[PDB]
Ligand binder design. Structure first.
Ligand code: NA
Lengths: 306, 303
């Protein structure tokens, strides 16, 4: 039993991290087969971060302008034999295919989806943590200068789903990056100017999952016969900065496992939003919305008598 | 900026995890050099977990009674050439040394110390998280049946400090394990019986690090000019379920950076203890004692 912030084992992603140097800038990179992905502002000098001309900087670059190094486990000498820019990322081609290339895929995650983050500095993994793509297309991580290139991913069986490469920090604790198709999450720009940040929202489906996890852990004082329909909750959610609830199979297994209907937890959220009545839920006195239904189903597994 | 629950990269430890099968019981093992560490109750059958006779079980075991397999990376079958019994842990000796053995030592963590846990099932790593050795010598993790043998560890430079091998679930959400000398944290026995746990406490030094982390992240409304001395706070701590505060160089670095004194946060802890009254610190309306001063230092200032 128990529920904690859990991240995938970083082992196979650790084997793909590299150090990307362009002139006097050093950032992290992702090495898959003969391709090395990295943020495109590694080309930018420190004095040009306010208004960078990425197209002119790319033209000025050559293959020798970029150096890729592999640190710690497994030594590698990499020669950049090609370079191209895709959106806000750089697509470097190297002479050596990564022998530890896992089965992988690329997906642009929706708000509310969770993924593991491998924070790296100068190509060296330094820590891992799980974040959730916020409704305002940011993430609440722990990044310092030089963490650009750190990758966000999920593990489904043996397939790694790369979905995030860190880029920038917009406010205290608030970060954002780009998907591996080059598009930045939330249409943000890799420009050091002020940008519009939308208001965050509580992920309703994750709070429901977190309450199911609490019920499954002997904490269900908040459960009452009172019910709030999905339609009525979603109208209430618009006025109270909550995401629209959309039921999935993952949430239905939790409703069946506990015997508590979704509409009961939807009502409980409306009450708990006002206050926890001095009580606690899984040691928390505030709503938790970074636990997805899929994460709860993974931490509270069990045999099912049929 | 930002403060999150962070764990060390588990890649080094992942290469040392193996599966240990003894009869119809399967647990997790730690493969270092020619030694494989695993919990001793892998010897016990599924029906004798309540009152196991480990003396009789160990005597009835042979080198052939243990099957060790490595799944991640290069798959391998390990031949057990010897087995010893150390406290609550089984010490297996295999014929092949782990070529991925990292620089490692063994440490016994004190209450308040944090470490990363690699949760494993059937010798396969499934997730990692960070816990803190509670003052009552438990940990608040997320374990299911078969997570025994999962290892807790820290990283001090380039050497991994193995400090915890998971053993059992004492109560709901409450777990405990043994150090790698066989000593179980909190003297809990490895038997499926109800065991009374000592009353938990707040890790005073970690709450201070968490308050220091909040100041460094734009949250310092709790800071006041009043000060409670370390001696005055520790006497107050003895009667309010708080651990004794012991300042370290790591806490001092936070005091120098934020310019807020330790005794300022010690007084604020006394005020925040009786409730936050609607206000929240770093997104929490309760005290957080799972962020160590070394964790806050590394996360906010990269040291
Ligand atoms: Na300094």
């Amino acid at each position: 039993s128990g529920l904690v912030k859990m991240s995938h084992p970083s082992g196979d992603v650790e084997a793909c991290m590299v150090q990307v140097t362009c002139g006097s800038m050093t950032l992290n990179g992702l090495w898959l087969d003969n391709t090395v992905w990295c943020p495109r502002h590694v080309m930018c000098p420190a004095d040009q971060l306010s208004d960078p001309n990425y197209d002119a900087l790319l033209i000025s670059m050559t293959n020798h302008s970029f150096s890729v190094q592999k640190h710690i486990g497994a030594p590698a000498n990499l020669r950049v034999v090609g370079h191209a820019m895709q959106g806000t990322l750089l697509k470097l081609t190297v002479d050596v295919a990564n022998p530890s290339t896992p089965a992988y895929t690329f997906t642009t995650v929706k708000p509310g989806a969770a993924f593991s983050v491998l924070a790296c500095y100068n190509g060296r993994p330094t820590g891992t943590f799980t974040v959730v793509m916020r409704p305002n297309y940011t993430i609440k991580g722990s990044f310092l200068c030089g963490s650009a290139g750190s990758v966000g991913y999920t593990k489904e069986g043996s397939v790694i789903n790369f979905c995030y490469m860190h880029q920038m920090e917009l406010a205290n604790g608030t970060h954002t990056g780009s998907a591996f198709d080059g598009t930045m999450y939330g249409a943000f720009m890799d420009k050091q100017v002020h940008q519009v940040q939308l208001t965050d929202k509580y992920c309703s489906v994750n709070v429901v999952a977190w309450l199911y996890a609490a019920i499954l852990n002997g904490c269900a004082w908040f459960v009452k016969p009172n019910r709030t329909s999905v339609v009525s909750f979603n109208e209430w959610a618009l006025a109270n900065q909550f995401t629209e609830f959309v039921g999935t199979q993952s949430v239905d297994m939790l409703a069946v496992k506990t015997g508590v209907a979704i509409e009961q937890l939807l009502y409980a959220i409306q009450q708990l939003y006002t206050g926890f009545q001095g009580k606690q839920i899984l040691g928390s006195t505030m709503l938790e919305d970074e636990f997805t239904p899929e994460d709860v189903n993974m931490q509270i597994m069990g045999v099912v008598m049929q």
